[PDB]
Amino acid sequence: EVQLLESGGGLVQPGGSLRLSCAASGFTFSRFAMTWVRQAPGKGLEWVSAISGSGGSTYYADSVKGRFTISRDNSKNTLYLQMNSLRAEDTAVYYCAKVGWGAFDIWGQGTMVTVSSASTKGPSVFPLAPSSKSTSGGTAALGCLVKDYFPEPVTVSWNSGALTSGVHTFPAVLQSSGLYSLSSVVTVPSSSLGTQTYICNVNHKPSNTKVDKKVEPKSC
Amino acid sequence: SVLTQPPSASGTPGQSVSISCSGTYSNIGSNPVNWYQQVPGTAPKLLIYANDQRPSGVPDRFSGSKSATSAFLAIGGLQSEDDADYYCSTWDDSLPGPLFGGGTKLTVLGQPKANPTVTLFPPSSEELQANKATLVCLISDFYPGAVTVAWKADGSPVKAGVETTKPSKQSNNKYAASSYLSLTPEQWKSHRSYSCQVTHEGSTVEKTVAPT
Amino acid sequence: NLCPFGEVFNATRFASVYAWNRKRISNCVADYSVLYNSASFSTFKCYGVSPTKLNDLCFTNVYADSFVIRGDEVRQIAPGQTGKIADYNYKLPDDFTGCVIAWNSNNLDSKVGGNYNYLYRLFRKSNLKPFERDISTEIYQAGSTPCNGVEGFNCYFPLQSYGFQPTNGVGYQPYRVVVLSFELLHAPATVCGPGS
Ligand SMILES: *[C@@H]1O[C@H](CO)[C@@H](O[C@@H]2O[C@H](CO)[C@@H](O[C@@H]3O[C@H](CO)[C@@H](O)[C@H](O)[C@@H]3O)[C@H](O)[C@H]2NC(C)=O)[C@H](O)[C@H]1NC(C)=O
């Protein structure tokens, strides 16, 4: 019966501004301090800001002081977070929560804030050559690095789809820059190297980018 | 300053587990401790407040305790639906708002533990010729799906330039992750070796590459 | 002539655990088996002595402490325990010599819609010493921001009400507790069993 419904998240560029809202129902809103807590993708929880039931006292983490302002409208059961001078590292899911006995006892389901300048960009594709350091037993690992593209997705195949056994394409990492990178690796018989050709085929439709990259053992 | 939790925990169905949180006299020793459960894709949920109190609707198989400078969350009768990240939190006498520990990923075990396969690639000649340098550490076939990744350069920890994904489930129900270390070409050649150390369930698998 | 245990166990009103009661018993004869013979008690646990052996012992004074807590907290009324009650409300010593007696009081201490008259201390900056008692009601300050006497974000009233309802699970039902502690001093023994 308690609900905390957040909105206002979205994509902004560095230096931009956003205002989050949290609409509360099902409890006596004005009697409780309220707080914002954020979580960067794949990371932990970080307290951001809190406000007393009346709105007359506010509290801030050092990480956001002078840039974010918490407020509330008790006539509307709405909690706000004004976010100015946004930085890449403010990218996170923002939760509102009710404060109860030293704890955060009810949380909204969050709104996502992305602070990024990324624009469509095709990947640079690099070969990950097989070596003694990537061969175990009679098997060698070779791959390709699909670096710094935006947005998702890319597709990777090996030998134009003729090679599927032993292919492992990894989920992309989303870097602090706002660009993605991924790698694809294939394990093959080490005795096949230098007799079988291995080519990764990378497609990034958003940038109409198509790259074939030969992956070969090195000679010195 | 900081609350420290083990990165993972596990048990089998119907058994118990204990998750720890370590701090100092000025936070855990002087302030009430809370615990939160975060099932992936959902908001944190309060399990324990004021060290050992349960809010309404939290069953009594969740319990909290505290030593001088450490707090502990015990979970009896483990179920699969307890798979989640668990966070401790408390206050510090020097700060206006609360701290959170780094979280413990709990997995209730459904198959045998499986060590990660790790492959580490050095920067490619082509990338080095573009004046860039990336080390690629690929981690696969591990279970439960929780690893921590440490990079070393000549035995010394490497902090900056590291990007690591969350684990993701493979088609065979084990997990994969990958970590990337960005360097300048000069950093790459100015060291004798770089290491990717993957710790899983308390055992470390290490791979190393060196300029050539 | 008989030690007045009936007045302690049968008192009409019991204290909140944070403001636990204490009666000093002395200059009287104590028939403890009167107590342990009754099946009325869900807990009757002695430490450093036996229920029967007591009628054969003497003591400088006996203290009877008494209060209400939840069923699932009765286990904290014991030497060596931690938890909200042991830490913040009523602490026995590691070498407690005495008896802990308890019984379900749901029929007297619960109310439809909740009995909120029984309180416990929820927050305390350090743990109680054994047999220490804290009835203060200063706002409790978490973190660095002074409360200045006002409840708020990081500032909490330190007592919370149990709010007992007859329909609670037994772990959350009210229990009456009596703790008997047996004091041996370099002085005259005034409380003795009927075997002495
Ligand atoms: C708290 O109050 C109850 C009720 O008044 C007390 O129970 C009473 O205990 C006395 C024992 O002192 C019982 O009297 C006995 O009666 C038998 C006759 O069958 C007699 O032979 C015994 O010598 C003794 O006089 C009495 O029946 C009993 N009443 C009830 C309702 O149980 C209880 O003892 C009090 N708690 C104390 C004193 O710690």
Q: Is C182 in the pocket of ligand 1 (CB under 6 A)?
A: no
- Report the distance separating Cα C182 and Cα C53, nearest Å: 13
CATH of the domain at A97: 2.60.40.10
Contact criterion met (CB < 8 Å) for C83 and B52: yes
Q: Do B117-209 and B8-108 have the same topology in CATH?
A: yes
For residue A74, the 8-state DSSP code is T
As to burial, measured by CB atoms within 10 angstroms (0-12 exposed, 13-18 middle, 19+ buried), residue B202 is: exposed
Claim to verify: residue A142 and residue A186 sit in the same structural domain:
yes
Domain that holds residue A136: 124-211
Residues 6+ apart with CB under 8 A from C153: A33, A35, A50, A51, A52, A57, A59, A99, C145
As to burial, measured by CB atoms within 10 angstroms (0-12 exposed, 13-18 middle, 19+ buried), residue A151 is: middle
Both tokens of B96, joined, read: 């206006």
Would A109 be classed as within a structural domain?
A: yes
What is the total count of domains within chain A? 2
Domain boundary among A72, A89, A115: A115
Q: Which of B131, B192, B140, B136 is nearest to B161 (CA)?
A: B136
Contact criterion met (CB < 8 Å) for B165 and A172: yes
- Report the distance separating Cα B77 and Cα B54, nearest Å: 17
Claim to verify: residue A35 and residue A105 sit in the same structural domain:
yes
| B60, C109 contact by CB (below 8 A) | no
Whole-number Å distance, alpha carbon C196 to ligand 1 midpoint, is 24
A partners (3+ CB pairs within 8 A) are B, C
Instruction: Report the topology of domain B8-108.
Output: Immunoglobulin-like (2.60.40)
Q: Which residue's CA lies nearest to atom 4 of ligand 1?
A: C10
Claim to verify: residue A101 and residue A167 sit in the same structural domain:
no
Q: Which atom of ligand 1 is nearest to the CA of C9?
A: 39
| C128, C87 contact by CB (below 8 A) | yes
Which DSSP helix (H) or strand (E) runs through C32? helix C32-37
The letter for the amino acid at B43 is: A
Q: In Å, what is the CA distance from B51 to each residue of B77, B98, C133? A: 21, 14, 20
Q: Which of A15, A88, A5, A92 is nearest to A49 (CA)?
A: A92
| B180, B165 contact by CB (below 8 A) | no
- Report the distance separating Cα A148 and Cα A127, nearest Å: 15
Both tokens of A28, joined, read: 């006596």
For domain B117-209, the question of CATH label 2.30.30.90 is answered with no
Domain boundary among A91, A115, A139: A115
Residue B27: its chain C contacts at CB < 8 A? Answer: none
Q: In Å, what is the CA distance from B36 to each residue of B42, B73, C11? A: 12, 10, 42
User: How far, rounded to the nearest angstrom, does the alpha carbon of residue B14 sit from its chain's CA centroid?
Assistant: 24
Whole-number Å distance, alpha carbon C34 to ligand 1 midpoint, is 9
Spans of all domains in chain B: 8-108, 117-209
Question: Helix, strand or coil for residue A30?
Answer: helix
- Report the distance separating Cα B202 and Cα A122, nearest Å: 39
The letter for the amino acid at B94 is: S
| B150, B197 contact by CB (below 8 A) | yes
Ligand 1 pocket test, candidate residues C32, C34, C36, C40, most atoms within 8 A of CB: C34
Q: Which of B21, B12, B210 is nearest to B107 (CA)?
A: B12
Spans of all domains in chain C: 1-113+166-196, 114-165
Q: Which residue of A has its CA nearest to B206?
A: A133
Going by DSSP bridges, is the β-strand pair A209-214/A92-100 parallel, antiparallel, or unpaired?
A: unpaired
Claim to verify: residue A131 and residue A104 sit in the same structural domain:
no
Would A218 be classed as within a structural domain?
A: no
- β-pair partners for C148: none
Domain boundary among A115, A147, A166: A115
Claim to verify: residue A106 and residue A132 sit in the same structural domain:
no
